[PDB]
Structure 1
Amino acid sequence: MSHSVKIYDTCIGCTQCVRACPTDVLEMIPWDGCKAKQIASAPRTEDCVGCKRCESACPTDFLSVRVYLGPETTRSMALSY
């Protein structure tokens, strides 16, 4: 909600975005719309720093996890002080 992270239906369940979140935002939930039978999910968008590496590892036509930068909070700005 600080930043908005959205995952579409193109996702093929490869678990490459989840493994690449450096602050544990995304996670994997069951589906039935792929051969792998699992689609990603973003239930902890607060801590989302905005580091687009989460979607530099989604290998689809355009993309299946997308990140929109909104307002910035004290943790979405990664302030240590």
Structure 2
Amino acid sequence: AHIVKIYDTCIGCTQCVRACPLDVLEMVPWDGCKASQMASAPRTEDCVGCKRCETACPTDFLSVRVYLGSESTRSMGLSY
């Protein structure tokens, strides 16, 4: 499975969660930013690695990173 990591530079804009096409990320309460929210990846077994979340992240540098790992039926997005 791919490795999805969230960093402390996240501003809690929830743009990465809305851009995820397989429901891998979510928002959890936090205290390190004004939005009082932080991105999380509790369902990385369903991540395909499209990196749409990185495209939707506005922080410099990115707060969410996807490292392509082992490949399975779910990570390869195979319907067969």
Mark yes or no: TM-score above 0.5.
yes
CA-to-partner distance for each residue in 1:20-58, whole Å, 9 max, x for gaps? 000000000000000111000000000001001111010
Q: Structure 1: give runs of 5+ residues left out of the alignment.
A: none
Residue in structure 1 matched with residue 65 of structure 2 by the alignment: 66
The RMSD of aligned alpha carbons is 0.5
Residue in structure 2 matched with residue 18 of structure 1 by the alignment: 17
Moved over 2 A (4+): none
SS in 2 for 1:55: helix
Q: Distance in 1 between matches of 2:39 and 2:19?
A: 12
The number of residue pairs the alignment matches comes to: 80
Q: Structure 2: give runs of 5+ residues left out of the alignment.
A: none
Q: Distance in 1 between matches of 2:55 and 2:12?
A: 15
What amino acid sits opposite 1:7 in the alignment?
I
Shift of 1:10: 0.1
Identity %: 88
Q: Distance in 2 between matches of 1:45 and 1:79?
A: 16
Q: Distance in 1 between matches of 2:32 and 2:74?
A: 34
What amino acid sits opposite 2:19 in the alignment?
A
SS in 1 for 2:45: helix
- TM-score of the aligned structures, taking structure 1 as reference length: 0.97
Q: Which has the higher helix share?
A: 2
